[PDB]
Amino acid sequence: THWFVTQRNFYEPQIITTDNTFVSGNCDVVIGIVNNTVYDPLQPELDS
Amino acid sequence: THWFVTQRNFYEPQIITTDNTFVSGNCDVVIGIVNNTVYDPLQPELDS
Ligand SMILES: *[C@@H]1O[C@H](CO)[C@@H](O[C@@H]2O[C@H](CO)[C@@H](O)[C@H](O)[C@H]2NC(C)=O)[C@H](O)[C@H]1NC(C)=O
Ligand SMILES: *[C@@H]1O[C@H](CO)[C@@H](O[C@@H]2O[C@H](CO)[C@@H](O)[C@H](O)[C@H]2NC(C)=O)[C@H](O)[C@H]1NC(C)=O
Ligand SMILES: *[C@@H]1O[C@H](CO)[C@@H](O)[C@H](O)[C@H]1NC(C)=O
Ligand SMILES: *[C@@H]1O[C@H](CO)[C@@H](O)[C@H](O)[C@H]1NC(C)=O
């Protein structure tokens, strides 16, 4: 049900954030891309 | 005219930000250092 990002050689699930991932292109080009939510750690810091 | 940062093996220009670069030293030591503007993605989030 949930999506995580792990190191390749050892299972260690982390919450998918903007500090784990980078942005390039859009979803109309990558084959097999999946919808999910990426957590932004700066948003609740701004809100609080 | 403009300055970008790209991976060395494939031309893919990106906006020079504090997440693409690291700070060390000052302008008076590096030979050939060039003036430019480094974008900070946190400033417009703080301002908005
Ligand atoms: C991922 O979400 C996007 C929208 O956030 C979905 O794209 C939509 O597709 C439906 C049906 O084709 C359209 O009614 C919407 O107008 C589309 N929105 C956009 C922004 O394109 C996409 O289908 C979702 N991906 C999957 C496979 O679930
Ligand atoms: C980069 O911009 C700085 C200004 O922020 C320039 O530094 C000035 O240049 C001359 C002296 O070299 C005078 O305007 C000031 O005394 C300098 N300021 C400081 C604090 O160094 C610098 O010359 C510019 N570099 C280039 C090549 O344009
Ligand atoms: C994987 O292959 C199946 C066919 O067995 C297809 O239905 C599915 O869309 C494919 N998914 C991706 C990400 O290529
Ligand atoms: C590069 O070479 C030119 C001569 O063609 C010289 O004017 C310039 O100062 C040099 N710059 C550096 C950083 O060595």
Residue-wise DSSP of B11-34: ---EE-BTTT----S-TTTSTT--
Report d(CA B18, CA B21) in Å as an integer.
5
Residue B31 CA: nearest ligand 4 atom is 13
Return the SS3 of A45: helix
Is there an atom of ligand 4 within 6 Å of B34 CB?
no
Distance CA B33, CA B47 (A): 30
Cα dist. A36→A1, A15, A26, A29, B48 in Å? 11, 11, 14, 17, 26
Regarding the beta carbon of B32 and ligand 4, being less than 6 Å apart is answered yes
Q: CA nearest A16: which of A26, A3, A27?
A: A3
Residues 6+ apart with CB under 8 A from A41: A17, A18, A19
Contact A24 B46 (CB under 8 A): no
For residue B4, the distance in angstroms to the closest alpha carbon of chain A comes to 15
CB B42 within 8 A of CB A42: yes
- Give how far Cα B13 sits from Cα of A3, B3, B18, B25, Å: 30, 9, 15, 25
A48 CA: distance to closest CA in chain B (Å): 12
**What is the number of CB-based contacts under 8 A between chain A and chain B?**
5
Please indicate the experimental technique that yielded this structure.
cryo-EM
